[PDB]
């Protein structure tokens, strides 16, 4: 299968995606792959190899490697990664993923720098339940993921990173939709300074807290630079009114922040309204949001997501 993509976002700007899938390499049903995405603030390249186990569809190994450059707000990171995964799914729909990932990261947090490396195991569970694929009328997504590391065991620090997300949709009356969204993240450690950007948390953006620019909701250090938070929350509620076929009208309320203290979350609130269009290039969403907290102006968001 082949793929090329063009995109735009308020978050990262113009964007190009590429995919290369090779669906059968050998008699055991192995799959080969490549993918990349190029945007001004972020560029990455990736490869993957797949081996079907038994049952062929729900159990498999996927070996992967990757590179990602990221220059966002006041932090930069060159991230190199290798990994092995074992996917397995029970009839509920609960997908477990057992992973072993090694990574090396060159990073700049504010006015400093680092290079650190980790071999970290992770486990994930997912659940996805919807009615159909171009017109979903109700459904949900549950995602849970924990990874961790022990210093000495190829790690500059001890790490316990946890992230979880939940999406839900209901249609009621004559096609009136309600959309619900929650996301939480946390990392526990005894050496926060050795902890690179990829393991820290940021908030704000199209799919996070609308009304605020991408990854700007964050703790700052002594000198006033957004260096990344130990924790995050992001929640959103959206009402959609079907206005025409392929056209919906949404209004929303968002809340969220990235923060270092459970006692001072400093929750930010965004509100707004937008237009949704299921176009022949994808679900496009164009939003107008007024940030109510901090120093709030008005903001234009563009995105092409589910
Ligand atoms: Pt999977
Ligand atoms: Pt990692
Ligand atoms: Pt998600
Ligand atoms: Pt602007
Ligand atoms: Pt896209």
CSV table of C-alpha atoms and ligand atoms in Angstrom, one decimal:
chain,number,residue,atom,x,y,z
A,1,UNK,CA,0.0,0.0,0.0
A,2,UNK,CA,1.2,3.5,-0.8
A,3,UNK,CA,0.7,6.8,1.0
A,4,UNK,CA,1.4,10.5,0.6
A,5,UNK,CA,-0.3,13.2,2.6
A,6,UNK,CA,-0.5,17.0,2.7
A,7,UNK,CA,-1.8,18.7,5.8
A,8,UNK,CA,-1.9,22.0,7.6
A,9,UNK,CA,-2.5,22.7,11.2
A,10,UNK,CA,-2.4,25.8,13.4
A,11,UNK,CA,-0.2,23.8,15.7
A,12,UNK,CA,2.7,22.8,13.5
A,13,UNK,CA,1.8,24.5,10.2
A,14,UNK,CA,2.2,23.0,6.7
A,15,UNK,CA,2.9,19.3,7.0
A,16,UNK,CA,3.8,16.4,4.7
A,17,UNK,CA,3.3,12.7,5.6
A,18,UNK,CA,4.6,9.7,3.8
A,19,UNK,CA,4.0,6.0,4.2
A,20,UNK,CA,5.4,2.8,2.6
A,21,UNK,CA,3.9,-0.5,3.5
A,22,UNK,CA,5.1,-3.8,2.1
A,23,UNK,CA,2.3,-6.2,3.0
A,24,UNK,CA,4.0,-9.6,2.3
A,25,UNK,CA,7.7,-10.2,2.3
A,26,UNK,CA,8.0,-13.9,2.9
A,27,UNK,CA,6.0,-17.1,3.6
A,28,UNK,CA,5.4,-16.2,7.3
A,29,UNK,CA,3.4,-13.2,6.4
A,30,UNK,CA,5.9,-10.6,7.5
A,31,UNK,CA,5.2,-6.9,6.7
A,32,UNK,CA,7.7,-4.1,6.1
A,33,UNK,CA,7.3,-0.4,6.5
A,34,UNK,CA,8.4,3.3,6.4
A,35,UNK,CA,6.8,6.6,7.5
A,36,UNK,CA,7.8,10.2,7.9
A,37,UNK,CA,6.3,13.5,8.7
A,38,UNK,CA,7.9,16.9,7.9
A,39,UNK,CA,6.7,20.1,9.4
A,40,UNK,CA,8.7,23.3,10.2
A,41,UNK,CA,8.8,22.8,13.9
A,42,UNK,CA,9.1,19.0,13.8
A,43,UNK,CA,10.6,16.4,11.4
A,44,UNK,CA,10.7,12.6,11.8
A,45,UNK,CA,11.6,9.4,10.0
A,46,UNK,CA,10.6,5.8,11.0
A,47,UNK,CA,10.8,2.2,9.9
A,48,UNK,CA,9.1,-1.0,11.1
A,49,UNK,CA,9.0,-4.8,10.6
A,50,UNK,CA,6.1,-7.0,11.5
A,51,UNK,CA,5.7,-10.7,12.3
A,52,UNK,CA,2.2,-12.2,12.6
A,53,UNK,CA,1.9,-14.6,15.5
A,54,UNK,CA,-1.2,-16.7,16.4
A,55,UNK,CA,-4.1,-15.6,16.1
A,56,UNK,CA,-2.6,-13.8,13.1
A,57,UNK,CA,-4.5,-10.5,13.7
A,58,UNK,CA,-4.5,-10.0,17.4
A,59,UNK,CA,-1.1,-11.3,18.2
A,60,UNK,CA,2.1,-10.1,16.7
A,61,UNK,CA,5.6,-8.7,17.0
A,62,UNK,CA,6.5,-5.4,15.6
A,63,UNK,CA,10.2,-4.2,15.7
A,64,UNK,CA,10.7,-0.5,15.0
A,65,UNK,CA,13.3,2.2,14.7
A,66,UNK,CA,13.0,6.0,14.6
A,67,UNK,CA,14.3,9.5,14.5
A,68,UNK,CA,12.6,12.7,15.5
A,69,UNK,CA,13.8,16.3,15.6
A,70,UNK,CA,11.7,18.7,17.5
A,71,UNK,CA,12.1,22.4,18.0
A,72,UNK,CA,9.0,23.6,20.0
A,73,UNK,CA,8.5,26.7,22.1
A,74,UNK,CA,11.7,26.9,24.2
A,75,UNK,CA,12.9,23.3,24.0
A,76,UNK,CA,14.7,21.1,21.4
A,77,UNK,CA,15.2,17.4,21.1
A,78,UNK,CA,16.9,14.9,18.8
A,79,UNK,CA,15.4,11.6,19.7
A,80,UNK,CA,16.6,8.2,18.6
A,81,UNK,CA,14.7,5.1,19.3
A,82,UNK,CA,14.6,1.3,18.9
A,83,UNK,CA,11.9,-1.1,20.0
A,84,UNK,CA,10.2,-4.4,20.2
A,85,UNK,CA,6.4,-4.9,20.8
A,86,UNK,CA,4.1,-7.8,21.4
A,87,UNK,CA,0.5,-7.1,20.7
A,88,UNK,CA,-2.3,-9.3,22.0
A,89,UNK,CA,-6.1,-8.9,22.1
A,90,UNK,CA,-8.9,-10.7,24.1
A,91,UNK,CA,-12.6,-10.8,22.8
A,92,UNK,CA,-13.6,-7.8,24.9
A,93,UNK,CA,-11.5,-5.5,22.7
A,94,UNK,CA,-8.9,-5.0,25.3
A,95,UNK,CA,-5.6,-4.7,23.5
A,96,UNK,CA,-2.5,-5.3,25.5
A,97,UNK,CA,0.8,-4.1,24.2
A,98,UNK,CA,4.0,-5.4,25.8
A,99,UNK,CA,7.0,-3.2,24.8
A,100,UNK,CA,10.7,-2.9,25.3
A,101,UNK,CA,12.1,0.4,24.0
A,102,UNK,CA,15.6,1.8,24.0
A,103,UNK,CA,16.3,5.4,23.3
A,104,UNK,CA,19.0,8.1,23.2
A,105,UNK,CA,18.1,11.7,23.4
A,106,UNK,CA,20.0,15.0,22.9
A,107,UNK,CA,18.0,17.8,24.4
A,108,UNK,CA,17.8,21.4,25.3
A,109,UNK,CA,15.6,22.5,28.2
A,110,UNK,CA,15.5,26.3,28.3
A,111,UNK,CA,19.1,27.5,28.6
A,112,UNK,CA,20.8,24.1,29.2
A,113,UNK,CA,21.3,20.8,27.5
A,114,UNK,CA,21.6,17.1,27.9
A,115,UNK,CA,22.2,13.7,26.5
A,116,UNK,CA,20.6,10.8,28.2
A,117,UNK,CA,19.5,7.2,27.4
A,118,UNK,CA,17.0,4.7,28.6
A,119,UNK,CA,15.9,1.1,28.2
A,120,UNK,CA,12.4,1.2,29.3
A,121,UNK,CA,9.6,-1.4,29.3
A,122,UNK,CA,6.0,-0.3,28.8
A,123,UNK,CA,2.6,-1.9,28.8
A,124,UNK,CA,-0.5,-0.5,27.2
A,125,UNK,CA,-4.2,-1.3,27.1
A,126,UNK,CA,-6.7,0.0,24.5
A,127,UNK,CA,-10.4,-0.3,23.8
A,128,UNK,CA,-12.2,1.1,20.8
A,129,UNK,CA,-15.9,0.8,20.3
A,130,UNK,CA,-17.8,2.5,17.4
A,131,UNK,CA,-20.8,1.8,15.1
A,132,UNK,CA,-19.4,2.7,11.7
A,133,UNK,CA,-16.5,4.4,10.1
A,134,UNK,CA,-17.7,7.4,8.1
A,135,UNK,CA,-20.8,8.2,10.2
A,136,UNK,CA,-20.1,7.3,13.8
A,137,UNK,CA,-23.2,8.0,15.9
A,138,UNK,CA,-21.8,6.9,19.2
A,139,UNK,CA,-18.7,5.3,20.7
A,140,UNK,CA,-15.6,5.5,22.8
A,141,UNK,CA,-11.8,5.2,23.1
A,142,UNK,CA,-9.9,4.2,26.2
A,143,UNK,CA,-6.1,4.3,26.2
A,144,UNK,CA,-3.8,3.4,29.1
A,145,UNK,CA,0.0,3.3,29.0
A,146,UNK,CA,2.7,2.8,31.6
A,147,UNK,CA,6.4,2.8,31.0
A,148,UNK,CA,9.3,2.8,33.5
A,149,UNK,CA,13.0,2.6,34.0
A,150,UNK,CA,15.6,1.6,36.6
A,151,UNK,CA,18.9,3.6,36.8
A,152,UNK,CA,21.9,1.4,36.5
A,153,UNK,CA,19.9,-0.8,34.1
A,154,UNK,CA,20.8,1.4,31.1
A,155,UNK,CA,19.1,4.5,32.5
A,156,UNK,CA,20.3,7.8,33.8
A,157,UNK,CA,17.4,7.9,36.3
A,158,UNK,CA,14.5,6.0,37.7
A,159,UNK,CA,11.3,6.8,35.8
A,160,UNK,CA,7.6,6.0,36.1
A,161,UNK,CA,5.7,7.6,33.2
A,162,UNK,CA,1.9,7.1,32.9
A,163,UNK,CA,-0.5,8.5,30.4
A,164,UNK,CA,-4.2,7.9,29.8
A,165,UNK,CA,-6.9,9.2,27.5
A,166,UNK,CA,-10.7,8.8,27.1
A,167,UNK,CA,-13.0,9.9,24.2
A,168,UNK,CA,-16.8,9.4,24.1
A,169,UNK,CA,-19.6,10.2,21.7
A,170,UNK,CA,-23.4,10.1,21.8
A,171,UNK,CA,-26.0,11.1,19.3
A,172,UNK,CA,-29.4,12.0,20.6
A,173,UNK,CA,-32.6,13.5,19.2
A,174,UNK,CA,-32.5,14.1,15.4
A,175,UNK,CA,-28.7,13.7,15.1
A,176,UNK,CA,-27.5,16.1,17.8
A,177,UNK,CA,-24.0,15.0,18.9
A,178,UNK,CA,-22.2,15.3,22.2
A,179,UNK,CA,-18.4,14.7,22.3
A,180,UNK,CA,-16.4,14.2,25.5
A,181,UNK,CA,-12.6,14.2,26.0
A,182,UNK,CA,-10.2,13.6,28.9
A,183,UNK,CA,-6.4,13.2,29.0
A,184,UNK,CA,-4.0,12.9,32.0
A,185,UNK,CA,-0.3,12.4,32.3
A,186,UNK,CA,2.3,12.0,35.1
A,187,UNK,CA,5.9,11.1,35.5
A,188,UNK,CA,7.5,10.2,38.9
A,189,UNK,CA,11.2,10.4,39.3
A,190,UNK,CA,14.2,11.0,41.6
A,191,UNK,CA,16.1,13.0,39.0
A,192,UNK,CA,13.8,15.5,37.2
A,193,UNK,CA,16.7,17.3,35.6
A,194,UNK,CA,18.0,14.2,33.8
A,195,UNK,CA,14.4,13.8,32.4
A,196,UNK,CA,14.4,14.9,28.7
A,197,UNK,CA,11.5,16.7,26.9
A,198,UNK,CA,9.9,13.5,25.4
A,199,UNK,CA,9.1,12.4,29.0
A,200,UNK,CA,7.9,15.8,30.2
A,201,UNK,CA,4.4,17.2,29.6
A,202,UNK,CA,3.0,20.1,27.7
A,203,UNK,CA,-0.6,21.3,27.0
A,204,UNK,CA,-2.6,23.6,24.7
A,205,UNK,CA,-3.3,23.2,21.0
A,206,UNK,CA,-6.1,21.9,18.8
A,207,UNK,CA,-6.6,18.6,20.6
A,208,UNK,CA,-5.6,19.7,24.0
A,209,UNK,CA,-6.8,23.1,25.4
A,210,UNK,CA,-8.2,25.3,22.6
A,211,UNK,CA,-7.8,29.0,23.1
A,212,UNK,CA,-4.1,28.6,23.8
A,213,UNK,CA,-1.1,28.0,21.5
A,214,UNK,CA,0.5,24.6,21.2
A,215,UNK,CA,2.4,23.3,24.2
A,216,UNK,CA,2.5,26.7,25.8
A,217,UNK,CA,0.6,25.7,28.9
A,218,UNK,CA,3.6,24.7,31.0
A,219,UNK,CA,5.7,25.4,34.2
A,220,UNK,CA,8.6,27.7,33.7
A,221,UNK,CA,12.0,27.8,35.3
A,222,UNK,CA,14.0,30.4,37.2
A,223,UNK,CA,14.7,32.4,34.0
A,224,UNK,CA,11.1,32.2,32.6
A,225,UNK,CA,11.4,29.4,30.0
A,226,UNK,CA,8.7,26.7,29.4
A,227,UNK,CA,10.7,23.6,30.3
A,228,UNK,CA,8.0,21.1,30.8
A,229,UNK,CA,5.7,19.9,33.5
A,230,UNK,CA,5.7,16.8,35.8
A,231,UNK,CA,1.9,16.5,35.4
A,232,UNK,CA,-0.9,17.4,32.9
A,233,UNK,CA,-4.6,17.4,32.5
A,234,UNK,CA,-6.7,18.3,29.5
A,235,UNK,CA,-10.5,17.9,29.3
A,236,UNK,CA,-13.0,19.0,26.7
A,237,UNK,CA,-16.7,18.9,26.0
A,238,UNK,CA,-18.2,19.6,22.6
A,239,UNK,CA,-21.7,19.9,21.3
A,240,UNK,CA,-22.3,19.4,17.6
A,241,UNK,CA,-25.4,20.3,15.7
A,242,UNK,CA,-25.8,18.7,12.3
A,243,UNK,CA,-26.4,21.7,9.9
A,244,UNK,CA,-26.2,19.9,6.5
A,245,UNK,CA,-24.9,16.6,5.2
A,246,UNK,CA,-21.1,16.7,5.6
A,247,UNK,CA,-21.5,20.0,7.6
A,248,UNK,CA,-21.7,20.3,11.4
A,249,UNK,CA,-21.6,23.2,13.8
A,250,UNK,CA,-19.8,22.8,17.1
A,251,UNK,CA,-19.5,24.8,20.3
A,252,UNK,CA,-17.0,23.7,23.0
A,253,UNK,CA,-15.5,24.2,26.4
A,254,UNK,CA,-12.0,23.2,27.2
A,255,UNK,CA,-10.0,23.0,30.5
A,256,UNK,CA,-6.4,22.1,31.2
A,257,UNK,CA,-2.8,22.6,32.3
A,258,UNK,CA,0.7,21.2,32.7
A,259,UNK,CA,2.1,21.8,36.2
A,260,UNK,CA,4.6,20.6,38.8
A,261,UNK,CA,2.6,20.7,41.9
A,262,UNK,CA,-0.6,18.7,42.6
A,263,UNK,CA,-1.5,21.6,44.9
A,264,UNK,CA,-1.3,24.3,42.3
A,265,UNK,CA,-2.7,23.0,39.0
A,266,UNK,CA,-3.6,26.5,37.8
A,267,UNK,CA,-6.3,25.2,35.6
A,268,UNK,CA,-6.8,27.2,32.4
A,269,UNK,CA,-10.2,27.5,30.6
A,270,UNK,CA,-10.9,28.0,26.9
A,271,UNK,CA,-14.3,28.4,25.3
A,272,UNK,CA,-15.5,28.7,21.7
A,273,UNK,CA,-17.2,27.6,18.6
A,274,UNK,CA,-16.4,26.2,15.2
A,275,UNK,CA,-17.3,24.6,11.9
A,276,UNK,CA,-16.8,21.0,11.1
A,277,UNK,CA,-16.6,19.8,7.5
A,278,UNK,CA,-16.2,16.2,6.4
A,279,UNK,CA,-14.5,17.1,3.2
A,280,UNK,CA,-13.0,14.8,0.4
A,281,UNK,CA,-9.6,15.3,2.1
A,282,UNK,CA,-10.8,14.6,5.6
A,283,UNK,CA,-12.6,15.8,8.7
A,284,UNK,CA,-11.5,19.5,8.8
A,285,UNK,CA,-12.2,21.5,11.9
A,286,UNK,CA,-11.9,25.3,12.0
A,287,UNK,CA,-12.4,26.8,15.4
A,288,UNK,CA,-12.7,30.3,17.0
A,289,UNK,CA,-11.7,30.2,20.7
A,290,UNK,CA,-11.5,32.9,23.4
A,291,UNK,CA,-9.1,32.1,26.2
A,292,UNK,CA,-10.8,33.1,29.5
A,293,UNK,CA,-7.8,32.7,31.8
A,294,UNK,CA,-4.3,34.3,31.9
A,295,UNK,CA,-4.3,37.0,29.2
A,296,UNK,CA,-6.9,35.8,26.8
A,297,UNK,CA,-7.5,37.1,23.3
A,298,UNK,CA,-9.3,35.3,20.4
A,299,UNK,CA,-7.7,32.5,18.5
A,300,UNK,CA,-8.1,30.6,15.1
A,301,UNK,CA,-7.6,26.8,15.1
A,302,UNK,CA,-7.4,24.5,12.1
A,303,UNK,CA,-7.1,20.8,12.3
A,304,UNK,CA,-7.8,17.6,10.4
A,305,UNK,CA,-8.7,15.0,13.0
A,306,UNK,CA,-11.5,12.4,13.8
B,1,LIG,PT1,-1.8,-3.6,17.9
B,2,LIG,PT1,10.9,5.9,26.4
B,3,LIG,PT1,-6.1,9.5,21.8
B,4,LIG,PT1,-2.9,34.4,15.7
B,5,LIG,PT1,-3.5,15.0,9.1
